[PDB]
């Protein structure tokens, strides 16, 4: 498996538009693109409101925040048995592939993943806040 | 960004990963539990702090914990 | 993606907006403020003259109403000045720049005060 | 008449103390939130899980107590 | 084409007490029994949520149909009780002889712990609680003259109540209709228009022509009630009727020969009010109900059932499409024949709106004899029916949202009206948001302006009739048009529909029945407060409906359901995002709006309409102080609340002392509710832990684990006690005030 | 007398209060006929009122300047001056009934915790078991002391859950 | 009949009966011993 490359030419689902879509943040900060392959034309629900028709084959939609792309991913995966992926697109044209991060969806354990933010103790074994006082900022005993 | 930590009481049931609406968590190989897998939090810059993961955790007390931290556009969930 | 309506996208509407001094690029920012200042300064005297605390006084009403409108123009000019200081700290249209907005604010003050004065002349 | 109102005042003092004392003594933790001390004095809540945890922080106990202090005074 | 026909299932459900002894049987979650106290609350919250217990639409429909027979059975018991208490525990017979000087009463309290003081001296040699429901005036209008007639109606009500409860059992356990039976919307409308409404109106017109009119004609002539012929004598003896109405000497021939002008003696178009009773002419109501019957019997032949002729409702909807609205009304027929919540949303909205119209039309055009001069009944009826309408309208918002989350399906709604409304919801809500701010500033801000100018000693700077004026010229113009209608635009009407338009007052028993209502600056200001409060209530409710399924904040709100507390402290905090929470907030604003509506009605009627009539003229209850005082907040606090609360807070030791007690009791319940609205369960659960420790220490800990209320229940408890306390406070305040000075 | 109070039987305000209350009823009684039901009801209220003022004075209640009975709560003053029936005796009446209710409920709770499904016996009451316990609760003061002396009334600290500290 | 008597043993029904009985006892005592303020 290798990181896919976004194709901006991909056609988008049939949709008449709405007032729930992108704002000035997309022009200045970042936006998100989700793509998937559809087996047939089918009506699905937009996370921004309304019904859209996915074209047979490649599809492409743009969203304002990451949660919107993953919300549609959950719908497509569970209700239609599809395998979408999405990216983060910066105003200068840079594209950052996001999901699934390593080609395998996170709920399925995969080799080569390195644990992060794992504490080798129980919650009840955290130290008292007095022991981390005056550490340079506000920090919980769970941060050590 | 919020702070998400996984503790060694995890049973590797995967329910926190399935419940995360932001894809912050994932399952990695482990040897400390029967399932031989542990939850991980590699992408905490995207955590919004909803705590759906904590709601899904079966262990007592929790094995996944969210500590709300500094607020950015991503953590605040803004689309503008 | 976005919802297009006759109000949002129409030929008559679009042409009218482009003619307004706010959207008329290629014009010096100071001139933009003066034209915008004159329009707003003239109308502002109305409500103060006809509904102020001295409205019923025969001749003092015109002076007090226009004089109060002039004070509101000064406050508005100060609001423009600080807005430019905050918004522009670090492009195509010179108006949206630190130097351009300052000139635009200055024009609004001169135009606004003149508009108030012109309104007073019309009354008397 | 003075008898009845003096017991109203005692009701106010004891209830205000109950809220403030409960807030202080549970500030570090409870059966509902065993690790509360890891979250600090003031924080929103711990989310809808475990039945729902609105106003669980010691700061919120003080917030509730002020209403009773005003009623008592 | 499917034939419209009866279709049932034989013996679908066995009649047994087995499930009565198994609480929670109806739900898969609760049927296993309690482990915590939350189970107990969940049992009751889910009891009638039929569609959450099953997905079979037929099973849901049958439960709905039999639940409705249960409701009707209860209403018949309630009605039977009212008639019975009128027959056995009232002064109705005495009241009939002297309606102006006797107070209606139909409740008598037992003498115990000193409570018999509540049996006041209401007149007619009787002691009891004075009623304000207006049943006495309704009974007189229908021609009832004896306790025997009231008693017989009460018996018949119980027989009907038993029949309703039998029908509910029969149509759920014995012969339950199939889903196709329920979906005959064309046939249902034909029967409910032509049959329920058309025949019902025709039948009632029959009672009015043959019983109400003859009896009320003799009552208004001073004839003693016991000397009036019994109703069956009027029915069997045409000669007696012909004496009262000569046209009866010609029988029904004029009706069949189209000589309808012969019946002008009992089918009239007088308008105005009967000067003896102060109510509408009964000959006008009889012609009204005849005309209504014909209209609804015609309406009941519009829809196609089984004989080709008629309209297909689906064909009508699909034909009405235009350039601006995509597919238009396509798919609405399917929604409205498969979702009960969609049907309930429309029906509650209009039934509630209808209730508010009834409140206005009955005060202005009092339909019952001696209703207008019973100020206690007039104030009560208007307030009661206004509140029902407000509550019903909020329920419309709730069940529109429930349809949005549970029953809405995108595949069936593509580019139609419903789909297109969702796709510009930000445009709808953003504009409605602006209107509310504009209305709030320019309506309540005017009062704040007036309070400040008055406090600064500049009355000449106030918005008032003697200062800067805000005349409701449009409303004034409409009044003039309606007052002059009989001359030009209603040539055959003797008088205008109502005396509120203009003209001369009607006095009954030395008191004003109705008179013209003038509209000044104060009336202009309060009407734009009403506009403000309604628009905000709509904003809260409409927002909940349009964002029930998703928003920019929570992209997948639909998966979280109709009723959930939040989606966590993240995203800055998402408390009360669910549609249910919008109904929760909408209730408060509905309460705030309708409180001002009824305060407007109460003060305006006392100040400018109600009063005593003597040689010197009309002296109103509050002496016409609404015009100059109602334009400041301090005016409402002083001249309305402080001044008119004198009766209720001084009622101890009198028959009205029960209103004094409830006045304080309602203040208590209102304040008690703030405990639930301001706090959170996390605090209470931790408190319960310490109390549980004490019970554990003494080996008296319950097996069902105590739990603090759920987040959503805490809100439901808070609003329920808020509304009950707030409404019951004004209820006591109104009744003590009006029963004393009325 | 105690705390400056005076006996109600010797209080002018107390006597005046009774006259006002009867005077209010007498005024209402004028508008009704002798045999009519309202007249009978009003006279019955008047008889109860006269008996009430007679009984309270007979019981020896102390009246304030307002003419209203005032209760005495200190056991010493109550027993010394014959006011024990105001607060002191009622005190032990309540505590007997209240403990009766509490003790019976506790017995039922303990009895059903040995069943297969204890929570089912808390929403569907075992009426035969509840009835038996209700009758035996008349001796709770004796039973409660024996448990206190036997060390079985209270549970041991090692079996009670607590939060971290 | 077993099931019906089981239904009558549910908490709301028992509470209704018990409080109806308790209220009746308190009301009837005040009917025969009116206006009791002290014990004599
Ligand atoms: C909405 C229905 C309704 C309501 C709220 C009431 C309410 C009342 N009724 Mg009425 N009643 C009703 C319907 C109703 N009734 C019907 C349908 C009938 C015909 C069967 C009666 C027949 C009736 C009689 C015969 C009497 C009452 C009486 C009463 C009063 C005392 C009841 C009581 O404490 O019983 C005791 C409580 C329990 C047994 C439990 C009370 C104000 C009594 C009354 O007015 O006394 C002066 C009385 O004697 N009612
Ligand atoms: C004696 C006859 C009888 C019997 C033995 C049954 C038995 C059964 N019915 Mg049937 N039913 C009957 C009469 C009967 N029904 C009648 C008269 C109707 C018409 C209303 C119905 C309508 C009906 C429906 C629509 C349903 C049942 C269902 C059931 C089952 C569960 C019942 C349950 O849990 O009740 C316990 C419930 C109660 C005790 C609530 C009683 C509610 C009534 C209307 C009185 C409320 C009045 C009260 C004063 C309201 C205000 C309270 C306030 C004052 C505090 C069970 C097989 C349910 C089922 O699952 O069937 C398979 C079901 O869905 N029945
Ligand atoms: C002319 C025929 C007719 C009449 C008079 C009614 C009357 C009524 N229907 Mg409708 N209905 C009809 C035909 C009719 N229906 C047909 C043909 C269908 C199938 C398409 C339906 C399907 C239907 C449903 C699904 C429901 C109703 C309901 C109602 C009630 C609404 C509440 C109300 O206004 O109470 C006013 C109350 C009265 C005026 C009391 C009238 C009582 C007498 C007994 C007449 C009842 C009508 C009945 C058809 C008579 C014969 C019944 C049987 C012995 C043959 C009302 C009693 C609702 C309801 O509450 O049901 C319980 C409801 O849920 N109806
Ligand atoms: C539904 C409403 C209604 C009803 C029920 C009635 C009823 C009546 N009206 Mg009224 N009326 C109404 C509306 C109504 N009216 C309206 C709207 C108007 C205004 C236009 C009038 C204007 C009016 C006038 C001007 C007169 C009446 C009269 C009458 C009476 C005689 C009618 C007649 O000649 O019938 C003719 C025949 C029939 C109606 C058919 C009867 C069929 C029977 C019941 C069949 C029974 C068969 C069965 C097998 C028998 C078994 C027996 C058993 C023992 C074995 C009657 C009591 C007359 C009267 O005398 O009033 C006092 C009269 O003069 N009405
Ligand atoms: C025709 C009228 C109607 C009907 C048939 C329904 C039916 C339904 N509604 Mg809807 N609703 C209505 C009107 C109606 N509603 C109105 C007017 C409102 C606005 C207030 C709402 C607001 C509303 C909400 C917000 C919700 C529903 C829900 C429901 C469902 C479950 C109800 C339940 O289990 O209650 C069980 C009944 C109770 C727990 C009893 C409640 C008693 C209240 C709180 C207090 C009553 C006080 C009393 C009148 C006076 C004081 C008495 C006291 C002193 C003893 C059901 C489909 C629920 C749902 O999820 O539907 C899908 C839901 O969440 N409704
Ligand atoms: C008296 C109490 C109060 C007040 C003043 C408000 C005010 C408001 N509420 Mg709120 N609300 C209240 C109680 C109150 N609420 C309660 C108890 C609840 C819980 C149920 C809510 C729940 C609630 C909801 C759910 C919503 C509102 C909405 C609104 C807004 C309506 C639009 C409007 O009129 O804007 C104009 C503001 C006013 C009329 C308030 C007074 C303005 C004064 C007179 C102006 C003074 C100007 C002056 C220059 C001040 C200078 C000061 C200084 C700097 C020198 C407004 C901000 C709605 C909203 O946001 O609509 C857009 C809305 O959705 N409220
Ligand atoms: C709640 C607290 C409280 C308070 C403030 C009082 C206050 C009082 N009690 Mg009371 N008393 C109480 C509870 C209380 N008592 C209880 C619970 C009991 C039952 C055990 C009694 C039994 C009791 C008796 C038997 C007598 C009093 C007496 C008195 C009065 C004078 C004695 C004294 O100094 O008492 C101050 C109180 C205390 C320091 C607390 C302990 C008091 C003990 C129990 C009684 C002491 C009596 C004293 C030695 C008598 C001296 C001679 C006397 C003629 C002055 C005084 C007003 C005396 C009195 O005036 O009777 C008419 C008296 O004879 N009390
Ligand atoms: C703290 C609360 C409180 C207290 C202590 C009392 C105390 C009293 N109230 Mg009051 N009351 C209260 C709250 C309270 N009330 C509230 C909230 C209300 C509003 C609902 C009322 C309304 C009220 C009324 C309307 C009346 C009273 C009356 C009474 C007296 C009843 C005595 C009796 O029945 O003896 C009977 C004797 C007994 C022993 C009762 C128990 C019987 C069992 C079988 C004993 C078993 C022993 C073994 C008593 C002085 C009555 C009175 O006459 O007061 C002067 C009276 O008429 N109360
Ligand atoms: C006025 C607006 C009329 C509007 C009117 O007559 O519309 C009528 C116009 C006609 O559309 P069609 O011819 O396509 O209609 C076919 C119908 O069968 C519906 O499908 O409908 C629309 O444009 C839909 C959206 C209108 C959106 C209007 C936005 C402004 C609302 C302002 C609300 C003010 C309320 C004041 C209350 C007193
Ligand atoms: C006061 C309060 C509580 C505590 C309230 C509770 C636990 C409800 C108490 C209900 C009754 C009184 C307890 C159960 C009663 C039983 C049915 C037994 C009754 C016995 C009699 C018949 C004798 C909350 O749980 C809560 C939750 C969320 C927001 C606000 C609040 C809140 O304000
Ligand atoms: S708090 Fe929410 S976004 Fe963050 S890891 Fe947990 S479930 Fe995911
Ligand atoms: S839900 Fe809890 S136990 Fe399961 S994988 Fe996540 S952290 Fe581990
Ligand atoms: S509703 Fe309660 S639990 Fe949910 S976010 Fe708000 S405070 Fe936290």
CATH value at residue A46: 3.30.1470.10
Top-level class of domain F1-164: mainly alpha
E687: nearest Cα among F106, D73, D60:
D60
Q: Is D58 on the interface with E (CB under 8 A)?
A: no
Q: Is the distance from the beta carbon of residue E709 to the nearest atom of ligand 10 less than 6 Å?
A: yes
Q: Is residue C23 marked as binding?
A: no
Return the ligand number nearest the Cα of E347.
5
Query: Residue E512 is inside which H or E element, if any?
Result: strand E511-514
Contact D32 E685 (CB under 8 A): yes
Q: Are E604 and E517 in contact (CB under 8 A)?
A: yes
Name which of E457, E467, E438, E500 is nearest E631 in CA terms.
Answer: E467
Among B17, B62, B80, the residue with its CB nearest the CB of A123 is B62
Q: Which atom of ligand 13 is nearest to the CA of D47?
A: 3
Measure in Å the smallest separation between the Cα of A73 and chain C Cα atoms: 18
Any binding-site annotation on E110?
no
- Chains linked to E by 3 or more Cβ pairs within 8 Å: A, B, C, D, F, G
Cα distance between residue E363 and residue D60, in whole Å: 50
> Secondary structure of E486-508 in the HEC alphabet?
CCCCCCCCCCCCCCCCCCCCEEE
When computed from its CA atoms, the radius of gyration of chain G, rounded to whole angstroms, is 16
**Radius of gyration of chain D measured on its C-alpha atoms:** 15
Closest partner CB to A140 (pick from B3, B9, B25) = B3
As to burial, measured by CB atoms within 10 angstroms (0-12 exposed, 13-18 middle, 19+ buried), residue E151 is: middle
* Distance in Å, CA E309 to ligand 3 centroid: 24
Cα F118 vs. chain centroid, distance in angstroms? 34
Nearest CA to ligand 10 atom 30: E676
User: What is the resolution in angstroms?
Assistant: 2.3
CB proximity D48 to B under 8 Å: yes
Sort out which chain A residues have CB atoms less than 8 A from E426's CB and list them: 19-20
Q: Given 3.40.50.1390, 1.20.1130.10, 2.40.110.10, 3.40.50.2300, which CATH number is that of E3-742? A: 1.20.1130.10
Q: Searching chain E, which residue's CA lies closest to the CA of residue F44?
A: E111
HEC assignment per residue over E420-439: HHHCCHHHHHHHHHHHHHHH
Q: Which residues of E touch G31 (CB under 8 A)?
A: 112
Chain-chain contact of A140 with D34 (C-beta, under 8 angstroms): no
Determination approach: cryo-EM
Distance E119 CA to ligand 1 centre (A): 16
Gap from CA of F132 to ligand 2 centroid (Å): 32
Q: By C-alpha distance, which of E141, E600, E219, E609 is closest to E375?
A: E609
Cα gap D63→D72, rounded to integer Å? 15
Number of Cα atoms under 13 Å in the Cβ half of residue A45:
24
Under DSSP, the state recorded for A131 is G
- E461 interface with C at CB cutoff 8 Å: yes
Structure tokens at E537: 């209530």
Q: Three-class SS string for E623-655?
A: CCCHHHHCCCHHHHHHHHHHHHCHHHHCCCCCC
Of F121, F109, F119, the C-alpha closest to E39 is F119
With beta carbons under 8 A apart, name residues in chain F contacting D34. Answer: 163-164
**Measured distance CA(E622)–CA(E615) in Å, rounded:** 19
Query: Which residue, by CA, sits nearest to atom 6 of ligand 13?
Result: E575
Interface touch A64/B80, C-beta < 8 Å: yes
Q: How far apart are CA E498 and CA A93, in angstroms?
A: 73
**Contact predicate B46/B74, CB 8 Å:** yes
Give distance in angstroms: CA of E256 to centre of ligand 4. Answer: 13
**Record: contact C2-A16, CB cut-off 8 A:** no
Q: What are the residue ranges of helices labelled H in E46-146?
A: 50-53, 57-88, 92-97, 135-141
Of E567, E689, E710, which has the smallest distance from its Cβ to D52's Cβ? E710
Pocket test for ligand 13, best of E554, E564, E569, E710 (most atoms within 8 A of CB): E569
Tell me the three state secondary structure of residue A42: strand
Q: How far is the C-alpha of E198 from the C-alpha of E300, rounded, in Å?
A: 8
Distance D26 CA to ligand 12 centre (A): 27
Chain F CB contacts of G6 below 8 Å: 124
Cβ neighbours of residue A27 under 8 Å, at least 6 residues apart?
A91
Q: How many CB atoms neighbour CB E198 within 10 A?
A: 22
How many alpha carbons fall within 13 Å on the CB side of residue E388? 15
Name the neighbours of A, counting chains with at least 3 Cβ pairs within 8 A. B, C, D, E
Q: Omega before B61 cis (within 30°)? A: yes
Verify B-E touch: 3 or more CB pairs within 8 A.
Answer: yes
Whether the CB-CB separation of E650 and E643 falls below 8 Å is answered with: no
Q: Are E610 and E512 in contact (CB under 8 A)?
A: yes
Distance (Å) of CA E542 to CA B52, E523, E547, E587: 28, 28, 8, 13
How far apart are alpha carbons E427 and E404 in whole angstroms? 19
Nearest residue (CA) to ligand 3, atom 27: E65
Determine contact, residues D56/E724, Cβ cutoff 8 Å: no
- Measure the CA–CA gap between E120 and E117, rounded to whole angstroms: 7
CA pair distance E201, E290, nearest whole angstrom: 7
Domain span at A46: 1-143
| Domain coverage including residue B43 | 1-80
Q: Whose CA is nearest to atom 15 of ligand 6?
A: E589
Q: Would you list the domain boundaries of chain F?
A: 1-164
Residue F146 structure tokens: 């024996």
Taking alpha carbons only, the member of E477, E479, E454, E478 closest to residue E467 is: E454
Which run of H or E residues covers position C35? Answer: helix C29-51
**Ligand in nearest proximity to the CA of E576:** 13
F124–G9 C-beta distance less than 8 A: yes
| Whether the CB of E235 sits within 6 Å of ligand 4 | yes
Q: Quick one: tokens of B31?
A: 């040897």
Cross-strand partners of A97: A87
Chain centroid to CA E480: 30
Task: Tell me if E681 CB under 6 Å of ligand 10.
Answer: yes
Set of chain G residues whose Cβ sits within 8 Å of the Cβ of F86 = 38-39
| Binding-site residue ranges of B for [4Fe-4S] cluster | 10, 13, 16, 20, 47, 50, 53, 57
Domain count, chain B: 1
Q: How is residue E213 written in tokens?
A: 């009119």
Chain D residues within 8 A of A141 when measuring between CB atoms: 37-38
Contact B58, B11 (CB under 8 A): yes
Q: Which atom of ligand 1 is the closest one to the Cα of G20?
A: 40
E711: nearest CB among D32, D46, D54: D54
Asked if the C-beta of D34 comes within 8 angstroms of chain A's C-beta atoms, the answer is yes
User: Rounded to whole angstroms, what are the CA distances from E156 to E71, E137, E233?
Assistant: 17, 21, 22
Contact B48 E571 (CB under 8 A): yes
Q: How far is F133 from chain D (nearest CA, A)?
A: 34
Is the separation of the CB atoms in E65 and E197 below 8 Å? no
The torsion angles phi and psi of B51, rounded to 5 degrees, stand at 65, 25
**Strand runs (DSSP E) across C5-123, as ranges?**
none
Q: Which residue of B has its CA nearest to D50?
A: B55
Number of domains in chain A: 1
Distance A20 CA to ligand 11 centre (A): 24
Contact indicator for E570, E546 with CB cutoff of 8 Å: no
CB contact under 8 A, A141 and D38: yes
In whole angstroms, how far apart are CA E688 and each of D35, E40, E706? 18, 17, 7
Lookup result for tokens 């995969």: A110
Q: Which of residues 39-68 of A touch E (CB under 8 A)?
A: 43-45, 47-51, 53, 64, 67-68
Which residues are CB-contacts of E471 (< 8 A; sequence separation ≥ 6)? E519, E520, E521, E524
Instruction: Identify the DSSP state of E44.
Output: H
* Pocket flag, ligand 1, residue E108 (CB < 6 Å): yes
- The alpha carbon dihedral of E695, E696, E699, E703 has a sign of positive
Interface mutation vs chain E, best among B16, B21, B57, most E CBs within 10 Å: B21
Q: If you measure from the C-alpha of residue E337 to the centroid of ligand 9, how many angstroms do you get, rounded to a whole number?
A: 26
What CATH number did the domain enclosing B53 receive? 3.30.70.20
Task: Report yes or no: B29 and A141 within 8 Å, Cβ to Cβ.
Answer: no
Neighbours of E521 (CB within 10 A): 24
Q: How far is F9 from chain G (nearest CA, A)?
A: 16
Report how far apart, in Å, the C-alpha atoms of A131 and of each of A128, A134, D35 are.
6, 9, 15
- CA-nearest residue to F115 within chain E is E703
DSSP states of chain F:
-GGG-EEGGG-HHHHHHHHHHHHHHHHHHTTS-TTSHHHHHHHHHHHHHHHHHHHHHHTT-EE-TTS-EE----HHHHHHTT-TTTTHHHHHHHHHHHHHHHHHHHHHHHHHTTSS-TTHHHHB--HHHHHHHHHHGGGHHHHHHHHHHHT-SS--GGGS-----
């Amino acid at each position: 498996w290798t990181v896919p490359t976004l194709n901006p030419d991909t056609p988008s689902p049939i949709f008449g538009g709405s007032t729930g879509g992108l704002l000035r943040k997309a022009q200045t900060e970042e936006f998100y693109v989700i793509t998937w392959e559809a087996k047939k034309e089918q009506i699905f629900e937009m996370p921004t409101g309304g019904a859209a028709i996915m074209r047979q084959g490649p599809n492409l939609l743009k969203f304002g925040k990451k949660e919107q792309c993953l919300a549609l991913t959950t719908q497509l995966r569970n209700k239609f048995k599809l395998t979408p992926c999405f990216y983060r697109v910066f105003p200068d044209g840079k594209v950052q592939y996001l999901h699934p991060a390593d080609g395998v969806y996170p709920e399925k354990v995969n080799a080569g993943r390195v644990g992060a933010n794992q504490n080798m103790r129980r919650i009840g074994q955290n130290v008292n806040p007095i022991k981390v006082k005056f550490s340079g900022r506000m920090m919980s005993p769970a941060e050590i | 960004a919020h702070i998400v930590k996984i503790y060694d009481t995890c049973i590797g049931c995967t329910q926190c990963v399935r419940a995360c609406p932001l894809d912050v968590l994932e399952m990695v190989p482990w040897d400390g539990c029967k399932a031989s897998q542990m939850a991980s939090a590699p992408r905490t810059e995207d955590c919004v702090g909803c705590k759906r993961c904590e709601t899904a955790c079966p262990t007592d007390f929790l094995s996944v914990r969210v500590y709300l931290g500094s607020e950015s556009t991503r953590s605040m969930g803004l689309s503008y | 993606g976005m919802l297009e309506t006759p109000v949002t996208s129409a030929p008559i509407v679009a042409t009218y907006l482009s003619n307004l001094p706010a959207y008329r690029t290629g014009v010096a920012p100071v001139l933009r403020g003066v034209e915008i200042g004159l329009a707003h300064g003239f109308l502002l005297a109305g409500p103060f003259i006809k509904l102020g605390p001295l409205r019923n006084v025969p001749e003092t009403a015109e002076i007090a109403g226009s004089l109060s409108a002039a004070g509101l123009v000064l406050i508005l000019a100060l609001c423009l000045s600080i807005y430019g200081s905050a918004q522009f700290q670090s492009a195509r249209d010179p108006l949206f720049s630190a130097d351009g907005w300052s000139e635009f604010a200055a024009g609004f003050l001169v135009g606004g005060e003149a508009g108030v004065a012109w309104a007073y002349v019309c009354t008397q | 008449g003075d008898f009845l109102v003096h017991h109203a005042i005692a009701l106010g003092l004891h209830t205000t103390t109950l809220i403030l004392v409960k807030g202080a003594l549970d500030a570090r933790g409870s059966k509902l939130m065993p690790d509360k001390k890891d979250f600090g004095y003031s924080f929103p809540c711990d989310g809808p899980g475990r039945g729902g945890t609105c106003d669980i922080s010691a700061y919120d106990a003080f917030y509730l107590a002020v209403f009773w202090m005003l009623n008592t005074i | 084409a499917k034939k419209v026909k009866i279709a049932v299932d034989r013996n679908p459900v066995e009649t047994s007490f087995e499930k009565w002894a198994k609480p929670g049987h109806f739900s898969r979650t609760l049927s296993k029994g309690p482990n915590t106290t939350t189970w107990i609350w969940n049992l009751h919250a889910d009891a009638h949520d039929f569609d959450s217990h099953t997905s079979d639409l037929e099973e849901i429909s049958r439960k709905v149909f039999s639940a409705h027979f249960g409701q009707l059975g209860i209403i018949f018991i309630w009605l039977s009780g009212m008639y019975f208490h009128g027959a056995r525990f009232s002064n109705y017979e005495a009241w009939l002889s002297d309606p102006t000087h006797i107070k209606p009463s139909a409740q008598v309290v037992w003498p115990i712990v000193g409570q018999e003081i509540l049996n006041g001296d209401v007149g007619g040699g009787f002691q009891g609680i004075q009623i304000t429901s207006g049943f006495f005036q309704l009974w007189r209008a229908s021609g009832i003259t004896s306790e025997l007639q009231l008693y017989t109606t009460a018996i018949g009500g119980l027989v009907m109540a038993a029949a309703m409860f039998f029908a509910g059992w029969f149509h759920y356990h014995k012969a339950a209709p199939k889903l196709e039976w329920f979906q005959n919307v064309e046939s249902m409308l034909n029967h409910h228009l032509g049959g329920l409404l058309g025949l019902g109106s025709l039948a009632w017109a029959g009672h009015q022509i043959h019983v109400s009119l003859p009896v009320n004609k003799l009552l208004d002539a001073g004839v003693d009630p016991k000397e009036i012929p019994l109703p069956h004598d009027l029915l069997l003896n045409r000669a007696i009727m012909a004496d009262l109405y000569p046209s009866f000497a010609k029988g029904i021939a004029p009706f069949f020969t189209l000589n309808w002008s012969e019946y002008s003696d009992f089918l009239t178009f007088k308008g105005g009010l009967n000067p003896v009773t102060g109510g509408l002419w009964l000959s006008d109501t009889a012609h009204h109900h005849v005309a209504i019957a014909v209209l609804f019997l015609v309406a009941g032949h519009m829809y196609r059932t089984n004989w080709g002729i008629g309209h297909s409702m689906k064909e009508i909807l699909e034909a009405h499409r235009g350039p601006f609205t995509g597919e238009g009304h396509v798919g609405l027929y399917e929604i409205l024949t498969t979702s009960w919540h969609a049907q309930l949303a429309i029906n509650l909205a209009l039934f509630g709106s209808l209730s508010i119209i009834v409140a206005h039309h009955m005060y202005a055009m009092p339909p019952y004899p001696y209703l207008a001069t019973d100020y206690g009944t007039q104030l009560s009826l208007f307030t009661h029916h206004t509140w029902i309408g407000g509550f019903c309208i909020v329920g419309a918002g709730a069940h529109a949202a429930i349809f949005m989350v549970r029953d809405y399906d995108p595949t069936n709604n593509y580019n139609n009206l419903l789909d297109r409304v969702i796709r510009h919801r930000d445009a709808i809500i953003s504009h409605l948001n602006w209107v509310c701010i504009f209305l709030g500033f320019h309506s309540f801000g005017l009062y704040i302006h007036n309070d400040t100018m008055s406090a600064l000693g500049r009355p000449q700077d106030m918005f008032s009739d003697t200062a800067i004026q805000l005349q409701p010229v449009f409303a004034q113009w409409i009044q003039n048009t309606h007052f002059l209608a009989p001359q030009l635009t209603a040539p055959n009407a003797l008088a205008a529909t109502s005396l509120t338009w203009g003209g001369d007052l009607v006095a009954v028993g030395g008191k004003v029945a109705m008179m013209p209502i003038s509209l000044g600056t104060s009336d202009f200001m309060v009407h734009h407060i009403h506009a403000f409060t309604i628009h905000v209530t709509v904003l809260i409710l409409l927002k909940g409906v349009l964002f029930a399924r998703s928003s920019r904040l929570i992209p997948d709100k639909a998966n979280l359901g109709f009723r959930f507390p939040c989606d966590g402290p993240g995203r800055g905090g998402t408390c009360q995002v669910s549609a249910w929470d919008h109904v929760f907030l909408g209730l408060f604003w509905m309460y705030n709006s309708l409180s001002i509506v009824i305060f407007h009605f109460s003060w305006k009627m006392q100040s400018d309409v109600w009063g005593t009539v003597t040689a010197s003229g009309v002296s109103h209850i509050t002496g016409g102080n609404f015009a100059q005082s109602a334009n400041t907040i301090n005016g409402w606090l002083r001249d309305f609340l402080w001044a008119q609360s004198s009766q209720v807070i001084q009622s101890y030791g009198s028959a009205l002392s029960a209103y004094g007690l409830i006045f304080l009791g309602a203040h208590f319940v209102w304040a008690f509710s703030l405990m639930f609205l301001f706090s959170g369960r996390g605090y209470w659960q931790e408190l319960i832990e310490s109390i549980v420790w004490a019970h554990n220490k003494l080996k008296v800990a319950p097996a069902i684990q105590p739990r603090a209320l759920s987040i959503t229940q805490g809100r439901a408890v808070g609003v329920a006690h808020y509304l009950l306390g707030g409404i019951a406070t004004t209820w006591s305040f109104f009744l003590a005030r009006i029963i004393s000075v009325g | 007398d105690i705390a400056g109070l005076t006996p109600c039987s010797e209080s002018k305000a107390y006597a005046k209060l009774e006259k006002k209350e009867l005077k209010t009823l007498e005024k209402r009684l004028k508008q009704y006929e002798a045999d009519s039901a309202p007249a009978v009801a009003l006279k019955a209220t008047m008889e109860r009122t006269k008996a009430r003022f007679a009984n309270y004075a007979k019981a020896g209640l102390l009246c304030g300047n307002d003419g209203l009975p005032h209760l005495i709560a200190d056991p010493g003053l109550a027993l010394k001056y014959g006011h024990a029936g105001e607060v002191f005796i009622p005190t032990f009446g309540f505590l007997y009934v209240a403990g009766y209710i509490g003790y019976v409920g506790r017995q039922y709770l303990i009895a059903v915790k040995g069943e297969a499904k204890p929570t089912d016996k808390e929403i569907i009451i075992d009426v035969p078991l509840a009835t038996k316990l209700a009758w035996q609760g008349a001796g709770w003061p004796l039973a409660a002391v024996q448990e206190l002396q036997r060390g079985t009334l209270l549970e041991k600290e090692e079996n009670i859950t607590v939060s971290p500290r | 009949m077993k099931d019906f008597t089981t239904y009558l043993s549910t908490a709301p029904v028992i509470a209704t009966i018990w409080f109806t009985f308790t209220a009746g006892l308190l009301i009837e005592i005040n009917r025969y011993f009116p206006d009791p303020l002290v014990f004599s």
